[PDB]
Amino acid sequence: EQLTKCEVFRELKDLKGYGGVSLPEWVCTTFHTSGYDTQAIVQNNDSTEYGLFQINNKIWCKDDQNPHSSNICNISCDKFLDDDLTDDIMCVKKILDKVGINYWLAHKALCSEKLDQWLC
Ligand SMILES: [La+3]
C-alpha cells in the first residue's frame, strides 16, 4: 500500500510535536524508511521490521519468527502491514518514549536539512 507525500503528511498528524519531531521530519523519515509502503518488510539476520515505520520484532511487536519478543507495543507485527496507521502511531509514541527518534537511522542524516521540501 503506497501512500503519496500528502496522504502520509495527513495520516501522521497525531505524531506532530511528539519528542519534538515536526511533521516534515516524520514525512522525510518514513520516505527514507519504507518509501511510504505500509506493507514494507526488511530482515537483518534474525530481525524483521514491519510497515511504514519499520518496527522490529525483537523489542516492539510479536510474530511467528520471534514469539519471545519483548513485545513492548503489545501487538502482533502483522497489524503494521494494514492501511490504518492508528496502532502503528501508538507504537511509534512508545518507541519515542523509550528509545527516541534515533530508532530511525535515516532521521539524523537525511531529515535535518531543507525540511520545507517535506510539506504537502
Ligand atoms: La495498522
Residue numbers in the entry: 1 to 120
Question: What does the publication say?
Answer:
The La3+ complex of apo-B-α-LA was crystallized as per the details given in the experimental section and the structure of the complex was established by single crystal X-ray diffraction at a resolution of 1.85 Å with one molecule in the asymmetric unit in P3121 space group. In the present structure, the La3+ is bound to the protein through the side chain carboxylate groups of Asp82, Asp87 and Asp88, and the main chain amide carbonyl groups of Lys79 and Asp84 in addition to three water molecules (W1, W2 and W3). In the structure of La3+-B-α-LA, the La3+ shows eight coordination with dodecahedral geometry while it is pentagonal bipyramidal w.r.t. Ca2+ in case of the Ca2+-B-α-LA structure. The analysis revealed that La3+ is coordinated in the metal binding cleft of B-α-LA with an additional water molecule as compared to that in the Ca2+ bound structure. The average La3+···O distance observed in the present structure (~2.5 Å) is longer than that observed for the average Ca2+···O distance (2.37 Å) by ~0.18 Å, supporting that the metal ion binding core expands in case of La3+ bound structure. Additionally, some unique conformational changes are observed for the amino acid side chains involved upon binding to La3+. The Asp82 and Asp87 side chains are in a similar plane for both the apo-B-α-LA and Ca2+-B-α-LA structures, while in La3+-B-α-LA, the side chain of Asp82 is rotated and hence the carboxylate group is almost perpendicular to what was observed in case of apo- and Ca2+ structures. The disulphide bond between Cys6-Cys120 in La3+-B-α-LA is flipped into an opposite orientation as compared to apo-B-α-LA and Ca2+-B-α-LA. A flexible loop (residues 105–110) below the cleft region adopts a helical conformation in La3+-B-α-LA complex. The average B factors suggest that the structure of the polypeptide in the La3+-B-α-LA complex is more rigid as compared to the other two structures.
In our study, we obtained bovine α-lactalbumin complexed with lanthanum ion (La3+-B-α-LA) and determined its high resolution crystal structure. The natural calcium binding site of bovine α-lactalbumin is replaced by lanthanum. The structure of the complex La3+-B-α-LA is composed of four α-helices and three antiparallel β-strands. The structure can be divided into α and β sub-domains and the presence of a cleft region clearly demarcates the existence of these two sub-domains.
